């Protein structure tokens, strides 16, 4: 019923920044150098309160309320990151390059980085049912991001959460059918035809790794914690291998998946569950 389908949107929502949060504890520390995370403690190089998350979900969060104020707007998307990002103290150049030339689609070749991943969700939520989704993922990622397997890896991941929300069981998902044999960068293309079966050695801040280290967190999880677990234990860029690993997960598993102490300790969760019903309630109407 709409419960049930409601539970899939606030989960990959949610879910984003519930693994931002754990992941951030570990974010820079090499695999197996340190004691497994399994709860929200906080900590990290940035010394964030339990439940704090990064800029991974502070884009989704610029990228949702974009989304409801202005329906596809990149120029509006850059717009609030700019106004984030100066109010603060590749992505970077990216929004310079906006402020100089006005240039939404900011992101040049050397962006090859998991920042387009780590924001996805709310896009999915809201145009789930675009015929041009794919293409919409490929414009939101290349506000701050060029790279051929950046964008596809956007693709690809926008592909998942699609299915995912819609019912789509782990085998299909993990099956990535319409991608076998398409023209897409080699690196992906190793992920899509298996690379992710293998665990990775370390949590990987390029695209294509980034994805690959969440589909194997997915694959071996039986649940959204187990899963979320493996995907910060890897360390390195575990704040982004968590939000990936979060959003497919979360859309899988469902907000009643994901362990209510978690979600009781996430900052902001009463305001990130209104964007998701949000979103969703838009995906319905026009
Ligand atoms: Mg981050
Ligand atoms: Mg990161």
């Given at each position: 019923?709409?419960?049930?389908?409601?539970?899939?949107?606030?989960?990959?929502?949610?879910?984003?920044?519930?693994?931002?949060?754990?992941?951030?504890?570990?974010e820079?520390?090499?695999?197996?150098?340190?004691?497994?995370?399994?709860?929200?403690?906080?900590?990290?190089?940035?010394?964030?309160?339990?439940?704090?998350?990064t800029?991974?979900?502070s884009?989704?969060?610029?990228?949702?309320?974009?989304?409801?104020?202005?329906?596809?707007?990149p120029?509006?998307?850059?717009?609030?990151?700019?106004?984030?990002?100066?109010?603060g103290?590749?992505?970077?150049?990216?929004?310079?390059?906006?402020?100089?030339?006005?240039?939404?689609?900011?992101?040049?070749?050397?962006?090859?980085?998991?920042?387009?991943?780590?924001?996805?969700?709310?896009?999915?939520?809201?145009?789930?049912?675009?015929?041009?989704?794919?293409?919409?993922?490929?414009?939101?990622?290349?506000?701050?991001?060029?790279?051929?397997?950046?964008?596809?890896?956007?693709?690809?991941?926008?592909?998942?959460?699609?299915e995912?929300?819609?019912?789509?069981?782990?085998?299909?998902?993990?099956?990535?059918?319409?991608?076998?044999?398409?023209?897409?960068?080699?690196?992906?293309?190793?992920?899509?035809?298996?690379?992710?079966?293998?665990?990775?050695?370390?949590?990987?801040?390029?695209?294509?790794?980034?994805?690959?280290?969440?589909?194997?967190?997915?694959?071996?999880?039986?649940?959204?914690?187990?899963?979320?677990?493996?995907?910060?234990?890897?360390?390195?860029?575990?704040?982004?291998?968590?939000?990936?690993?979060?959003?497919?997960?979360?859309?899988?598993?469902?907000?009643?998946?994901?362990?209510?102490?978690?979600?009781?300790?996430?900052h902001?969760?009463?305001?990130?569950?209104?964007?998701?019903?949000?979103?969703?309630?838009?995906?319905?109407?026009?």
């Amino acid at each position: 019923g709409l419960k049930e389908r409601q539970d899939r949107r606030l989960g990959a929502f949610l879910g984003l920044a519930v693994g931002d949060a754990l992941g951030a504890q570990v974010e820079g520390l090499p695999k197996g150098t340190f004691p497994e995370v399994r709860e929200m403690k906080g900590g990290g190089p940035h010394r964030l309160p339990p439940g704090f998350w990064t800029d991974d979900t502070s884009q989704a969060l610029c990228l949702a309320e974009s989304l409801l104020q202005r329906g596809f707007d990149p120029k509006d998307q850059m717009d609030r990151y700019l106004r984030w990002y100066r109010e603060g103290y590749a992505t970077r150049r990216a929004l310079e390059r906006y402020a100089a030339t006005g240039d939404p689609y900011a992101g040049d070749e050397a962006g090859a980085g998991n920042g387009p991943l780590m924001r996805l969700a709310p896009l999915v939520l809201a145009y789930e049912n675009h015929p041009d989704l794919l293409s919409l993922a490929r414009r939101a990622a290349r506000t701050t991001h060029g790279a051929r397997e950046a964008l596809e890896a956007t693709e690809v991941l926008a592909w998942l959460l699609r299915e995912a929300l819609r019912g789509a069981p782990k085998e299909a998902l993990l099956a990535l059918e319409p991608f076998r044999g398409a023209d897409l960068h080699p690196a992906l293309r190793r992920v899509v035809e298996g690379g992710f079966w293998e665990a990775p050695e370390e949590g990987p801040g390029y695209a294509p790794g980034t994805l690959a280290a969440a589909l194997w967190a997915f694959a071996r999880g039986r649940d959204f914690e187990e899963g979320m677990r493996l995907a910060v234990n890897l360390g390195g860029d575990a704040d982004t291998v968590g939000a990936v690993y979060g959003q497919l997960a979360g859309a899988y598993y469902g907000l009643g998946a994901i362990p209510g102490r978690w979600l009781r300790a996430l900052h902001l969760r009463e305001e990130m569950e209104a964007l998701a019903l949000a979103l969703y309630r838009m995906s319905m109407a026009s």
